Every structure is written in structure tokens, then in C-alpha cells.
């Protein structure tokens, strides 16, 4: 009984630790985005 409830509480704690790593990756994406995008025509998908 306590084992089932302990794995669900620790699951959200592990996601919160990985959430800070994703936020750091989002900052890297924002840093990798620079104002000029120029222009490109997409002729095929």
C-alpha cells in the first residue's frame, strides 16, 4: 500500500529535477535564436 503511494510522489520529484534541465535547454534555444532569420522558400515538405 505504501509502496504504490511512494512511487507516485517520487515520480513528480524526479520530473521537477529534469524540469530545470529542460528550462536550461530552452534558454539555450533562446540563445541560439538570433534576430535575423533571413528568408527561405520551402519547395518540399
Amino acid at each position: 500500500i505504501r509502496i504504490f503511494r511512494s512511487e507516485l510522489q517520487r515520480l513528480s520529484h524526479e520530473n521537477n529535477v529534469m524540469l530545470e534541465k529542460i528550462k536550461d535547454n530552452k534558454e539555450k534555444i533562446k540563445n541560439n535564436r538570433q534576430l535575423p532569420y533571413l528568408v527561405a522558400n520551402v519547395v518540399e515538405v
Binding site: P36, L38, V39
Partner: protein, 122 residues
């Protein structure tokens, strides 16, 4: 003689990396500004350092830097035509009293043209 006084600023107004600006026109404004070059090339940039957000208008020539494109100074639009620059004259030799006669055809032109310009409140 006048060139010597302007050579002092030559260490700034010349060697600076700002002045080499690329002139272009902003096609789309998002409030990201889509700007089309003269080489048939476009890009998207933001404001500058001293650039005000209300100075940039739709369909206006906007100069940007040559290396890394960024808005620096706005420019008046319609820069292509060179023909109408010579159409404006200055100080015509014919005066107002050169037209001979007291004929009332003179009084009709001054009231519809000269009067609203000199006395707009009449």
C-alpha cells in the same frame, strides 16, 4: 583649408563600423520587422539602440548595418526617382506686376491660390 578641420573627426566618423549602412525597406511590421534589400533578399530584425518604436513606419526606407543587419537610422521614402528633384524652381524672375493690364483675370487667380495661403483664416 576647410578639409583640415574635418580631418580631426576622421578618426571617428570614418573608421567607425556604424556608418557603412545598407539601405533597405521594411515590408512587414510585427508588434520582428521584415525588411527587403536591394539584392532581392529579406530578413527580420528588431529595433536598435537609439531607434524609437514609433519612428519605423510601414513602407519606409530603413537603413541597416552591412555585416550584422540591425536597424540604425530611418530614411525618407521614395529614394529612387531623381527626376522630380530638378522640377522645383527657385525665385522666378517674373514678378506679380509684370502682367500688363488691370484685367480681372488677375484677381481671380490670387483669391483662389494666394489668398488661402496668405490668409487661411479668412
Amino acid at each position: 583649408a576647410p578639409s583640415h578641420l574635418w580631418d580631426i573627426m576622421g578618426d571617428r566618423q570614418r573608421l567607425g563600423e556604424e556608418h557603412p549602412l545598407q539601405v533597405a525597406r521594411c515590408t512587414k511590421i510585427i508588434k520582428k520587422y521584415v525588411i527587403n534589400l536591394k539584392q532581392i533578399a529579406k530578413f527580420v530584425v528588431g529595433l536598435g539602440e537609439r531607434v524609437s518604436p514609433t519612428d519605423i513606419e510601414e513602407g519606409m526606407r530603413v537603413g541597416v548595418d552591412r555585416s550584422k543587419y540591425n536597424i540604425e537610422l530611418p530614411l525618407p521614402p521614395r529614394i529612387d526617382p531623381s527626376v522630380t528633384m530638378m522640377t522645383v524652381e527657385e525665385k522666378p524672375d517674373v514678378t506679380y506686376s509684370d502682367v500688363g493690364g488691370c484685367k480681372d483675370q488677375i484677381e481671380k487667380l490670387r483669391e483662389v491660390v494666394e489668398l488661402p495661403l496668405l490668409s487661411p483664416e479668412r
